[PDB]
Design a protein around this ligand. Structure first.
Ligand SMILES: CC[C@H](C)n1ncn(-c2ccc(N3CCN(c4ccc(OC[C@H]5CO[C@](Cn6cncn6)(c6ccc(Cl)cc6Cl)O5)cc4)CC3)c(Br)c2)c1=O
Ligand SMILES: *[C@@H]1O[C@H](CO)[C@@H](O[C@@H]2O[C@H](CO)[C@@H](O)[C@H](O[C@H]3O[C@H](CO)[C@@H](O)[C@H](O)[C@@H]3O)[C@H]2NC(C)=O)[C@H](O)[C@H]1NC(C)=O
Ligand SMILES: *[C@@H]1O[C@H](CO)[C@@H](O[C@@H]2O[C@H](CO)[C@@H](O)[C@H](O)[C@H]2NC(C)=O)[C@H](O)[C@H]1NC(C)=O
Ligand SMILES: *[C@@H]1O[C@H](CO)[C@@H](O)[C@H](O)[C@H]1NC(C)=O
Ligand SMILES: *[C@@H]1O[C@H](CO)[C@@H](O)[C@H](O)[C@H]1NC(C)=O
Ligand SMILES: *[C@@H]1O[C@H](CO)[C@@H](O)[C@H](O)[C@H]1NC(C)=O
Ligand SMILES: *[C@@H]1O[C@H](CO)[C@@H](O)[C@H](O)[C@H]1NC(C)=O
Ligand SMILES: *[C@@H]1O[C@H](CO)[C@@H](O)[C@H](O)[C@H]1NC(C)=O
Ligand SMILES: *[C@@H]1O[C@H](CO)[C@@H](O)[C@H](O)[C@H]1NC(C)=O
Ligand SMILES: *[C@@H]1O[C@H](CO)[C@@H](O)[C@H](O)[C@H]1NC(C)=O
Ligand SMILES: *[C@@H]1O[C@H](CO)[C@@H](O)[C@H](O)[C@H]1NC(C)=O
Length: 1161
């Protein structure tokens, strides 16, 4: 039996009384079921006769509105007090825990029948129920603050208000919700024929249903595990120099015993060529120019060069295989247009809130006297137009709108997009001139805790959601905050996203035409308030083509010195001048011809090779000239033979040595063109063919016109073993004495023992910020970005077509929370989020599959399907005769299983954010999931957008890649797929530019090793016999490039593809200093090997040393007027540490080994 019923007259305003009626319960109306099912679901079962009507519940839901405004966070905490009020409104047990003390009469103006108001009663309640409620609801965090939600509802300090006094305060009429006081009796036992309410409860740790998730420990920190820390650092410093400083000690012992050991076919085939070349040098010169000019006229047909940024991965590589999934499926990745704002002039600020005292410091840049000027600049940038094809272009035609056909507010991720980018909304001062209750400070403080919630709970009714319909995040907007709270902000971030659409080409430069005006405006700007830095994602590329056009003058003068040196260095007033200039025209045309061939073939000429190859072909091609003509000058003419037979003899002498040096490295490059890195793949083709066609040109063109020079010097008019043989005959023998031969082997094995030591500390990855001019705005940006932001580039985890999404497991593989499996996708993203320094992934996954379930949840009151045609009624329409989507049934409260799931899905995808509902799907998930029509319906690819931490250096990017791929493959195998039909590969903007660095250490051990293996093989073909003649070459070519790895560390040079092409250069140029001494050693008619080497030194070695000084003096001219930094950091020190380290181990070290293990016939 119940105590009262109905609604008696007014106490004051809207607050009414109840009417006394101590009889049987009343069968509820049919239309009242929709309220009682939502409010008191623990009563609607079996018989429906309770002691309430619809009007009590109608006013009662209005009475407890503010508890729903505060206690919407944890549903279980609200559920406990909801159980209390249900029992107070219409329990059938009201005769058991209620005793009415005061009763008043009442007169009705309408019906005139004398009724009875309910004045005052006693509520017998369980004490343990209050304790359970308090223990479950003590730690509920209030919105826009770090205090308790009870504090606003206790009417006092939150820490001192107990369960008991708070329930008294809730029952009190002073607060302004309850009509009159309800006197409680806090007991746990039957006292004098009463049965107090001890109805069952559930604490905030425990859920009431499956769909109701356990209240996450931001508001109930009773039972959640601590922030875990499984970074185990592995152990370095094991093999430092234990096998370096104690391996050379055996060298200083084996080489020390020698200190104590004292105690006792082709000439016939080149002479015959050289004969014909000298007999008729009229036609053979004509057959050179025609063949060149024919093969060097195809360049003008193509001459194409590739300068996008993505030229650093092969189009069949895995990176671009992943990237080219985004042309058909869900479009491109959007560019950014970042613009960082900060103010050093403005000082700190302190805010003091009104009702409670919890002062909060605001940083410099977010004060109103700055924010007006920030908004001025903000609105000024959207008033920027450019011209394409002589038509105007504005921002709205290029920037994306996440929901486009409804409205076309362009997207801006400014902080002022919390304030909807307006002036009048800023200064909503609520209150009198004396004090202010609510301002932009508290609104800003509320709008950072929940960026999706439209209607703010403050005095204001300002939407927090962005102007473009999408939630502006606190991640992408603020900078230099102390990692949790955003009130200490010191840098504003402005972002203008814009489309790409790769399959189109006519509307990309359309956008770049705007972006140049964007830069042109932001550069030409003056402001004493604040300092700015900016970045367009075209401007990462523009600075390369700006900076690269600043070292044309430095280097043409570098080649001029090499052009002048060839004149001076031939002879001993009748020196060889003209043929030096002719010899330049050979190599300068040879390299042009080699580019002209492959131009017609169709391979694009990169910016790497264009300056690297004219060093190579010159530095190799001229060393043919310096050896040949000096070998001619060191020969004397015989008694009975003319110049023809002389040149044939000396050609047959020298040329078979030279043929090896040409044909070895040439073939070494074309058998080192099998790597797939497209900077080194495109180099070796040119590097091989240029020197190939060069060597085929000196044998044709150069030697034929030497006779003309001898004819010219026979006439003794213009257009003797004296120069170095005096020097080398004095310099040579002191090396090969017993006095110095242990020293120069001990030092130059010591440097190998030094170079083998620090190979562990070989530096990997190019630094991004060491490729810019120092005076640029970009270097200022790369200083800023590493200093302020906490959320770098986004990453997408794309799951391909093939997965179910209908059956339970279909959900459970991608499911997240609400009583679900702990090995799912978004769960594993969420587990890796806290371990940001371990695995470089910043923050929450923010998926659609969980939000969709909240949208299709029966208590949403969001979606309404039409009664007759199944058309989607809008959430903000009057709703006259269209019905709920999911029938409000306990079996129906679960997530959908059949095709109704995918039947309801497109209506979610076509929903704008309405105030009565949540955000919907079409705001931020319109491009998220692909729909496919056929076999009913089907769903395509899904991606879960999350953000990486701030990344600054080369180590960070590759560290992010490895662990992103680890996470993907970890969940792939755990997900339990049949075959390799679909993966969960990650994607970002930069996973093409840093895939090659993942496998740089593998392919170089292939590439240089195979090139080195080519030097082993072809010399066996060229030298015929003598294995030990080729092994000693292979050893010295190995030992020079390990010292090249040594000098990488010694200066601090990275191991990028830009350095790898100039590293494989060493394999091609070091053989030049090795063959011309080895052939000279293997054929020499002396018995004893000691004096045999001096022949090889004095006859060939001097002319080799004469051919290093041009590149030696071509080095000094680079640094003497060095302008750029990228050219100075790789392409200076590599050449210097290649010439001065190759020539050292070539013509000083090697003869000493030839005096030790010198073979003979
Ligand atoms: C976040 C990732 C981000 C996207 N990212 N990461 C790495 N990179 C990147 C991309 C490309 C590059 N490159 C690599 C090669 N760079 C380079 C550096 C020096 C370098 O020598 C300077 C050369 C040359 O020609 C000239 C001038 N010229 C004249 N006509 C055409 N050009 C030149 C000079 C002498 C002679 Cl005889 C002939 C020439 Cl053609 O000056 C030539 C090229 C040029 C720049 C770099 Br470094 C980094 C990025 O963009
Ligand atoms: C970063 O933001 C936090 C937000 O809490 C700042 O902490 C607050 O610092 C200011 C200055 O002290 C105050 O608002 C407040 O400190 C006050 O707390 C005591 C409590 O009894 C009070 O008596 C004093 O008036 C004192 O000023 C801090 N707030 C809290 C909740 O602790 C923090 O200082 C900011 N960081 C920096 C570097 O400024
Ligand atoms: C985004 O679009 C909404 C409308 O869908 C804009 O709201 C109104 O815009 C008009 C100007 O078109 C202005 O009077 C106000 O800004 C809004 N009206 C009212 C009554 O307040 C909104 O301005 C758009 N956002 C931006 C940044 O332009
Ligand atoms: C900026 O807006 C003002 C007012 O609408 C207008 O006079 C001016 O022409 C605009 N600027 C440009 C570059 O179009
Ligand atoms: C360019 O556009 C302007 C105005 O839109 C017009 O007057 C002019 O004739 C155009 N010029 C050309 C070459 O199309
Ligand atoms: C926000 O909620 C309050 C609660 O009373 C209401 O007055 C106001 O109209 C709501 N705002 C909007 C924009 O509907
Ligand atoms: C910012 O500069 C403007 C220039 O008109 C000036 O009016 C304003 O006082 C400056 N701000 C501050 C905080 O001094
Ligand atoms: C997931 O939960 C089950 C049941 O509690 C447990 O056996 C399993 O170890 C959990 N998974 C992981 C990865 O710990
Ligand atoms: C992890 O990195 C963050 C940078 O966002 C830093 O604040 C924090 O100190 C790091 N964690 C540890 C344990 O050092
Ligand atoms: C809601 O639906 C009605 C149906 O006529 C439509 O007029 C209105 O534009 C819709 N609102 C939104 C925000 O899509
Ligand atoms: C919905 O349709 C059914 C049958 O088509 C009908 O009985 C019912 O009255 C309709 N509901 C409304 C609100 O018109």
């Amino acid at each position: 039996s119940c105590v009262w019923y109905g609604e008696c007259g007014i106490a004051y305003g809207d607050k009414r009384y109840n009417c006394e009626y101590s009889g049987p319960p009343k069968p509820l109306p049919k239309d009242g079921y929709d309220l009682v099912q939502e409010l008191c679901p623990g009563f609607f079962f079996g018989n429906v006769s309770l002691c309430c009507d619809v009007r009590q519940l109608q006013t009662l839901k209005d009475n407890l509105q503010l508890p729903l405004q505060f206690l919407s966070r944890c549903p279980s905490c609200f559920y406990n007090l909801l159980n209390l009020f249900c029992e107070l409104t219409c329990s059938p047990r009201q005769s058991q825990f209620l005793n009415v003390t005061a009763t008043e009469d009442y007169v009705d103006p309408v019906t005139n029948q004398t009724k009875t108001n309910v004045k005052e009663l006693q509520y017998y309640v369980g004490q343990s129920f209050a304790n359970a409620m308090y223990n479950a609801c003590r730690d509920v965090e209030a919105p826009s603050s770090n205090d308790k939600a009870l504090g606003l509802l206790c009417g006092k300090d939150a820490d001192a208000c107990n369960a008991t006094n708070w329930i008294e305060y809730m029952f009190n009429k002073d607060n302004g919700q309850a009509p009159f006081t309800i006197t409680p009796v806090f007991s746990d036992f039957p006292v004098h024929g009463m049965e107090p309410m001890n109805n069952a409860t559930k604490g905030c740790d425990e859920s009431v249903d499956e769909v109701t998730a356990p209240c996450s420990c931001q508001d109930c920190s009773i039972v959640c595990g601590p922030k875990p820390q499984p970074p185990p650092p592995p152990a370095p410093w094991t093999i430092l120099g234990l096998d370096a400083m104690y391996v050379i000690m055996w060298i200083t012992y084996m080489a020390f015993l020698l200190v104590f050991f004292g105690a006792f076919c082709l000439r016939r085939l080149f002479t015959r060529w050289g004969s014909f070349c000298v007999r008729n040098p009229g036609c053979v010169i004509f057959f050179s120019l025609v063949f060149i000019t024919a093969c060097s006229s195809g360049l003008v047909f193509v001459r194409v060069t590739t300068n996008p940024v993505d030229l650093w991965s092969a189009p069949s590589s895995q990176a671009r295989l992943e990237k080219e999934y985004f042309d058909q499926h869900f479009g491109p990745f959007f560019r950014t247009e970042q613009l960082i704002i900060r103010a050093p002039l403005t000082d700190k600020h302190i805010y003091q809130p009104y009702p409670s005292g919890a002062d909060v410091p605001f940083g410099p840049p977010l004060d109103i006297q700055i924010l007006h000027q920030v908004l001025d600049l903000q609105i000024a940038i959207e008033n920027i137009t450019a011209s394409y094809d002589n038509e105007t272009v504005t921002l709205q035609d290029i920037c994306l709108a996440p929901l486009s056909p409804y409205n076309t507010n362009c997207t801006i991720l400014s902080v002022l997009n919390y304030f909807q980018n307006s002036h009048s909304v800023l200064d909503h001062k609520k209150g009198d001139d004396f004090f202010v209750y609510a301002d932009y400070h508290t609104h800003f403080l509320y709008c950072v805790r929940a960026p999706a919630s439209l209607n703010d709970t403050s005095l204001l009714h300002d939407p927090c959601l962005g102007t473009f319909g999408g939630p502006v995040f606190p991640w992408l907007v603020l900078g230099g905050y102390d990692d949790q709270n955003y009130n200490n902000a010191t840098a504003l971030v402005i972002t203008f996203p814009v489309n790409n659409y790769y399959n189109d080409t006519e509307k990309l430069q359309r956008a770049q035409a705007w972006e140049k005006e964007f830069i042109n405006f932001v550069k030409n700007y003056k402001n004493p308030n604040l300092t700015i830095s900016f970045t367009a994602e075209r401007s990462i590329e523009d600075e390369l083509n700006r900076e690269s056009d600043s070292d044309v003058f430095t280097v043409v003068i570098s080649y001029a010195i090499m052009f002048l040196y060839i004149s001076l260095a031939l002879g001993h007033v009748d020196s060889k001048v003209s043929l030096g200039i002719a010899g330049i025209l050979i190599v300068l045309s040879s390299v042009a011809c080699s580019l002209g061939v492959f131009s017609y073939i169709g391979l694009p000429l990169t910016l790497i090779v264009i300056e690297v190859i004219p060093f190579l072909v010159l530095a190799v091609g001229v060393d043919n000239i310096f050896i040949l003509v000096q070998a001619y000058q060191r020969d004397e003419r015989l008694q009975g033979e003319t110049l023809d037979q002389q040149l044939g003899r000396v050609l047959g002498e020298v040329a078979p040595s030279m043929f090896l040096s040409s044909f070895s490295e040439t073939v070494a490059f074309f058998l080192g063109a099998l790597s797939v890195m497209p900077a080194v793949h495109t180099f070796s083709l040119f590097a091989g063919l240029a020197v190939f066609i060069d060597f085929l040109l000196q044998i044709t063109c150069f030697v034929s016109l030497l006779g003309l020079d001898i004819k010219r010097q026979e006439k003794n008019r213009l257009d003797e073993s004296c120069l170095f043989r005096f020097f080398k005959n004095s310099y040579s023998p002191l090396l090969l004495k017993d006095w110095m031969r242990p020293i120069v082997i001990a030092i130059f094995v010591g440097v190998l023992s030094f170079s083998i030591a620090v190979l562990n500390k070989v530096d990997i990855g190019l630094d991004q910020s060491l490729s810019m001019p120092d005076d640029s705005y970009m270097v200022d940006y790369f200083k800023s970005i590493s200093q302020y932001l906490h959320a770098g580039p986004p990453v997408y985890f794309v799951l391909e077509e093939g997965h179910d999404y209908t059956s339970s497991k279909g959900q459970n593989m991608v499911c997240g929370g609400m009583g679900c499996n702990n090995d799912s996708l978004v769960q594993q993203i969420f587990n890796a989020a806290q371990l940001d320094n371990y695995t470089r992934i910043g923050f929450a996954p923010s998926s659609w599959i969980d939000d969709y379930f909240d949208w299709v949840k029966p208590q949403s009151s969001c979606c309404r399907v039409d009664n007759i045609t199944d058309q989607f009624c809008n959430a903000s329409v009057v709703d006259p005769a269209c019905v709920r989507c999911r029938p409000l049934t306990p079996e129906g409260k679960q997530r959908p299983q059949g095709g109704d799931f995918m039947r309801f899905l497109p209506m979610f995808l076509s929903d704008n954010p309405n105030p009565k509902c949540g955000k919907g799907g079409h705001a931020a998930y319109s491009s998220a999931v692909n729909i496919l029509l056929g076999h009913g319906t089907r769903v395509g690819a899904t991606y879960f957008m999350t953000y990486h931490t701030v990344l600054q250096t080369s180590a960070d990017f590759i560290d992010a890649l490895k662990k992103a791929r680890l996470i993907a493959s970890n969940v792939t195998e755990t997900m339990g797929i049949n075959g390799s039909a679909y993966r969960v590969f990650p994607y970002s903007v930069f996973y093409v530019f840093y895939e090659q660095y993942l496998t740089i250490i593998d392919d170089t051990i292939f590439n240089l090793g195979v090139s080195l293996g080519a030097i082993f093989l072809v010399t066996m073909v060229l030298l015929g016999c003598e294995l030990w003649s080729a092994v000693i070459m292979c050893a010295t070519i190995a030992m020079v490039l390990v010292n090249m790895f040594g000098v990488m560390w010694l200066w601090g040079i990275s191991l990028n593809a830009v350095s790898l092409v100039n590293l494989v250069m060493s394999c091609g140029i070091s053989v030049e200093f090795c063959s011309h001494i080895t052939r000279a050693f293997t054929v020499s008619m002396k018995g004893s090997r000691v004096e045999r080497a001096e022949e090889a030194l004095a006859h060939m070695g001097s002319s080799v040393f004469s051919g290093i000084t041009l590149t030696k003096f071509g080095g000094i001219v680079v640094l003497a007027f060095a302008k750029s930094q990228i050219f100075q950091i790789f392409y200076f020190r590599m050449y210097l540490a290649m010439v001065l380290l190759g020539a050292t181990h070539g013509l000083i070290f090697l003869p000493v080994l030839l005096s030790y293990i010198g073979p003979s016939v």
